[PDB]
Nucleic acid binder design. Structure first.
Ligand SMILES: [Mg+2]
Ligand SMILES: [Mg+2]
Ligand SMILES: [Mg+2]
Ligand SMILES: [Mg+2]
Ligand SMILES: [Mg+2]
Ligand SMILES: [Mg+2]
Ligand SMILES: [Mg+2]
Ligand SMILES: [Mg+2]
Ligand SMILES: [Mg+2]
Ligand SMILES: [Mg+2]
Ligand SMILES: [Mg+2]
Ligand SMILES: [Mg+2]
Ligand SMILES: [Mg+2]
Ligand SMILES: [Mg+2]
Ligand SMILES: [Mg+2]
Ligand SMILES: [Mg+2]
Ligand SMILES: [Mg+2]
Ligand SMILES: [Mg+2]
Ligand SMILES: [Mg+2]
Lengths: 16, 50, 64, 71, 75
RNA sequence: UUUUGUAUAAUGGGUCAGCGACUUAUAUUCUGUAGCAAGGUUAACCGAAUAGGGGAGCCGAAGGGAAACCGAGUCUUAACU
RNA sequence: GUUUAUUAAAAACACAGCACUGUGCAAACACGAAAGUGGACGUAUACGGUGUGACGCCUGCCCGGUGCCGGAAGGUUAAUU
RNA sequence: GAACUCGCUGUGAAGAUGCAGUGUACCCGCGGCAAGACGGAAAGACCCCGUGAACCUUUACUAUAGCUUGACACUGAACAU
RNA sequence: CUUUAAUGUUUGAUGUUCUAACGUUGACCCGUAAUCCGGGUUGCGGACAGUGUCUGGUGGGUAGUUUGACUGGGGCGGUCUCCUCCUAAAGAGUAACGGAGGAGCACGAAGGUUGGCUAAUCCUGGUCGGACAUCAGGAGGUUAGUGCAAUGGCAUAAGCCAGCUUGACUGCGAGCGUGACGGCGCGAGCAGGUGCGAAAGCAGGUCAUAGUGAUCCGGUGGUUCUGAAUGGAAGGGCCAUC
């Protein structure tokens, strides 16, 4: 898978 | 293929011509037929295989 | 502004007395030796546009 | 540059002689028109002299019947 | 290796028994002469049977072969 | 809202107030309505200016044919039952 | 030694050394419609480009393909006439 | 979105606090724990689709800077052949 | 004129030499208390080099773009138009990456007409000659044949021979069939001219259904229909055809 390939290298959203 | 399109031209001096096909390899002689010429309105000799 | 005429259409359709359009038949330009004389003879005269196609022709020719 | 004239128009020329110039003066044809032909449309009830205009067979009879002349 | 078929040719009987037809009307389109031509009926180059006179369609079986014949009874 | 089908655990909205999406111009066709009628109507412009003048034009009263041309016919064809 | 400032510091990049190739000086080459400037106030023990990567022992066979270098007889071939 | 926001078995746009049947449950805090509310966050980044985009490659197509060939111009005089 | 030698010569080419165009990022002088620039003097090159216009080659160095659809996800593979049969439910029509096969021609006779004719297979006898060549008789009955797939047909043969031939005609066409349309198909009869037959008659290709490509842009022949002042012409139109 649903949310793969990494997002924020693990933290999700990040930015900011 | 093999069969080629030819023209049968009128011998009455008019330019009227018929079109047909011919097998050149088997029949090398020129096709000659009596056909109706609409310009002069009579049956005349049509010749040529070109 | 003024509507522009589709020029290609203007060279293929002509309006008749009661509002129809006449056109030349297709299939009589080349490759004619194989076609029968009967078939070719019936294609020579001009024909009328069918009901289904009139709407399209009228749109293309607003000043016909 | 070609036009057609109805028998009804013949009486509007004001003069009795129907020519290319007179038709133009009566605002029947147009300045650029050079050739004109009278056809059997409507009726003519007055002697008129048509000059220099082609006339159909039907129109000729009508004009002559009314007492006119096609020159 | 399959998947190919030709277009349907709309063959068959066009006017059935008793129907009033005009000269020229096609009565049956067929591949072979299943039906044969009778009185006032002609056979075309593709074996199409057509009316040569106005009247009513009549189906009959005739001959030592008991074959089917279509005729136009002028009415 | 979108769908064959949503209480759906499918979408959108925390709430309130204000604002927020089929318009305008010019052509063309049809319907209704009004004027005039085998005729109808003017544009620019002029003008004491929504008057009046201006008919240049445009559409209609005839069509057939690629066209010359012919004409209540015309084209097709040597000619049409 | 250097590197992905902010998830990768390494086996990647660079390196001394090696080889091929271009370059005779108004050099090759690069930036520039151009003038000009760098190369260099240098001159083949010099300068540019490419590949390999201290040092030791070494680096075989193939020139048909593609590129580069050379050759000129003939064939084909532009503007022009 | 609004809530007077329990369990189970079934049903159902096919994994129910809200539907059916049934079981259990006085009203309201405080400290704790994360099994669920397909919990929050970002109009899935995988996958496909659009006659979407951008960069990159090449013996894809069409062009073109650069390099190179000849003709004519700037461009003349002898002489031999 | 035959046949040719020079000479002059529009010129062409090649070589050599020259100087006056042009080059100088050699030296010196001046503007000028200036390694720019310009002028002067001289040397070295020299009609070369270089630049403009035109032109052949090369050219991912750079630029603009294209790179199909169906599909039991997409890719890979297969497929895309036409004809025959079944699915298709006794009118027509009817789907799937359902089950099976074909076509992209051939023929101046294999077309027209008049006259004639009739298979396959088996048995028996008969030189070579045997399972089967050819001949005779019998049985049988279309199981054969049809230019090519399949289906429907075919003895009055549409199958097989022979004579004569060009209707594998031109202009048309009542009336139908089938398509959304573009189209495609069947057609009696009418006018002109023709072949075969004594004649009634039959013939506008082939037993039927595949054998194919719109429009545009051109090409060739015919035809004044048009012809930008006028007469022509060019170009266009129309008819035949590529
Ligand atoms: Mg043509
Ligand atoms: Mg006027
Ligand atoms: Mg759904
Ligand atoms: Mg419901
Ligand atoms: Mg919801
Ligand atoms: Mg809920
Ligand atoms: Mg929300
Ligand atoms: Mg270190
Ligand atoms: Mg980092
Ligand atoms: Mg780190
Ligand atoms: Mg290395
Ligand atoms: Mg529960
Ligand atoms: Mg608590
Ligand atoms: Mg969530
Ligand atoms: Mg999305
Ligand atoms: Mg590119
Ligand atoms: Mg696809
Ligand atoms: Mg059926
Ligand atoms: Mg049924």
């Amino acid at each position: 898978x649903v949310a793969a390939x990494x997002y924020x290298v693990x933290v999700x959203i990040x930015x900011x | 293929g093999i069969r080629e399109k030819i023209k049968l031209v009128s011998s009455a001096g008019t330019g009227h011509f018929y079109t047909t096909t011919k097998n050149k390899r088997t029949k090398p002689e020129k096709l000659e037929l009596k056909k109706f010429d609409p310009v002069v309105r009579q049956h005349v000799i049509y010749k040529e295989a070109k | 502004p003024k509507i522009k005429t589709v020029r290609g259409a203007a060279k293929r359709f002509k309006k008749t007395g009661k509002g129809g359009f006449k056109h030349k038949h297709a299939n009589l330009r080349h490759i004619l030796t194989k076609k029968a004389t009967k078939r070719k003879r019936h294609l020579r005269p001009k024909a009328m546009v069918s009901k289904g196609d009139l709407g399209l022709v009228i749109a293309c020719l607003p000043y016909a | 540059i070609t036009a057609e004239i109805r028998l009804s128009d013949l009486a509007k020329v004001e003069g009795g002689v129907v020519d290319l110039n007179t038709l133009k003066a009566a605002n029947i044809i147009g300045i650029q028109i050079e050739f004109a032909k009278v056809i059997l449309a409507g009726e003519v009830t007055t002697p008129v002299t048509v000059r220099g205009l082609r006339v159909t067979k039907g129109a000729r009879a009508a004009i002559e019947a009314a007492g006119g002349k096609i020159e | 290796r399959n998947g190919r078929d030709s277009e349907a040719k709309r063959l068959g009987v066009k006017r059935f028994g008793g129907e009033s037809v005009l000269a020229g009307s096609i009565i049956v389109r067929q591949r072979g002469t299943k039906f044969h031509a009778g009185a006032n009926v002609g056979c075309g180059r593709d074996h199409t049977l057509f009316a040569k006179a106005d009247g009513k369609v009549k189906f009959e079986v005739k001959g030592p072969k008991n074959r089917k014949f279509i005729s136009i009874e002028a009415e």
